[PDB]
Symmetry: C3
Subunit: 175 residues, 3 copies
Amino acid sequence: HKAQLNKNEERFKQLEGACYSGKLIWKVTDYRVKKREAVEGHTVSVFSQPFYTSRCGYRLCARAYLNGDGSGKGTHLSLYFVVMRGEFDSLLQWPFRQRVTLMLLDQSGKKNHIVETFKADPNSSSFKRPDGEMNIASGCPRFVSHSTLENSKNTYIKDDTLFLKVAVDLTDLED
Amino acid sequence: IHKAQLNKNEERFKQLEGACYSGKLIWKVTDYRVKKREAVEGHTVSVFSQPFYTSRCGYRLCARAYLNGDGSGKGTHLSLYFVVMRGEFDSLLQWPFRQRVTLMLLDQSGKKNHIVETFKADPNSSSFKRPDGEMNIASGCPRFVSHSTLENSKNTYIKDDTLFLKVAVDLTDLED
Amino acid sequence: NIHKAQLNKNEERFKQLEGACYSGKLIWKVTDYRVKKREAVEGHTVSVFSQPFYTSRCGYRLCARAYLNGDGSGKGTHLSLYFVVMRGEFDSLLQWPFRQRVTLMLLDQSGKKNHIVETFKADPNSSSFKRPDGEMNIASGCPRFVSHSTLENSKNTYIKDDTLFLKVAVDLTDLED
C-alpha cells in the first residue's frame, strides 16, 4: 500500500505537471543537494513530468544530468530531450520531425537565457515511434558548464533553484 | 468498503486523464476483438468514452458505442452515439444544446480516409434538453459503420486490435 | 487516524485539479447558499474559498474568497468578495508587483445577463500584490460587493436552486505566456 500511495502520488504529480502546447517549464529545487546526489552516484539524473504537443499529440519530457553526462560528465549540466510512448502514437507522424529548443532561464530579469536549438534528425533513433516507455534521449551533454551555471555573479540559480525550459515548434502539426 | 474507494479513485483519475476542453474527443478503443465478443455475448453491450467538454466551464459530454450494434444496426454495425451529460455549469449554459456535431472513425492507414457523419442538433430532441439526471438520451448513428467495412482485412480502421473514434463539436456562437 | 488526513489530502488535491483554469478566468459555483450563509452568521465558517486558478499554465496562482455574511465595511449586510494572489510555483519568473486589471462578478442566472460587476486596476503599492511570502497575500476587493437585499430577492435570479455563481476575470494584457 506504500506502492499504492506512491503510485497515487506520482499520478497526481503528472496531472499537476502536464502541459499541452509543446512547452515545458521545469523548476528544479534543492540544487546543491541534487548535484551532491549526482556527484556521489546516488541519483545520476532527474526527469521532468511528461508534457505534450497537444492534448492528443506526442508525449515528451526532459532529463538532466546535474553532474554531467558523457561529453560533459563532471563539468557541465547535461540537458536532454525525450520522446516518450504516447497514448495516440499510432495516429502521429513518425519520425518526430519538430524543431526543439532547450533553455536555462536567467532569473535576473535581464532575460539573458542560455538557449540551444536544433532540428530533429529523422535518422536518429531518438525520434522513431517509441517501442518501450521512451526513446533514447537526445540533446546537449555540455549544455552549460558548472562554472557558468554556478558562478556567483550569475542568476541562473536563485535560492538553490533553477528553471529549465523546453519548447517544441508546432509548425505543421495536425492536431 | 475500500475496493469501492480504490475504484472511485481509479475512475476519477481516469476522467482527469481523459478530459479535453475544446469540444474535441479522440477515443482510443483497445482490445477490439474481446470487447466485440463481450457485446455479442450480451456481457457488455456498450462502452463509454471519458467525459469531454466544450470549454473548461461549458457542456459536459461523452460518446458511447455499441460494438455489436444497437437497434437499427444491431448485430451488423458499430453504433456510435453522442451524449450530453449533466454539467457543473448547466445553469449558465444555453438550452437546448444547438451545436453541429461530427462523428468519426479514423483511418489509420495514412490515406486519412475516415468515416464521418455530421448533423445539426435538433432543438426538439430530448437528447439536447438541459439534463435532468446523469445524462440525456444518446443520439447518433445506430448504423454508423458496418462490421463488414470496419473489420475488412484489407482495411485499416482496426490496427493491432485497436480503433480510434473522434467526436467534434462545432463551437461557433459559443462562449467560454 | 493519519489516513483520514491522507484521504483528505487526496480529496483536496483532486478538487484543485478538477477546478484549475488557465486563462485568468474563474467561474465559481456556490451551492447550498442558505446553509453556508447560516454558517457565516453563526460564526461557524466565516468565509469560503474558490479553488486556485491561473493566468497561464506557468503564471500567477490565484483564487477568490467570499464572506457570505459580509466582512468589515459590509459585515452582516453584504456578501463580501475578495481577490487573492497566492504563492505560485513560478513566482520567481513573474513580474512583481502584480499589475493586471481585475473584474469581479456575480452572475445573473435569469438570461437577461444583468450581472453585477466591479472592476479595478491593481494598486502597485498594495501589499495584496507583492510577490507572496507565505501561502497567500492579503485579500483585496469589495467588502460591499452586493447587499444581501439585492442578492437574495425573488424577482432577482442571482440565487437559483440555492446556488449562485461568482466570476473573476483577470486582464492578460501585456502578459507573455
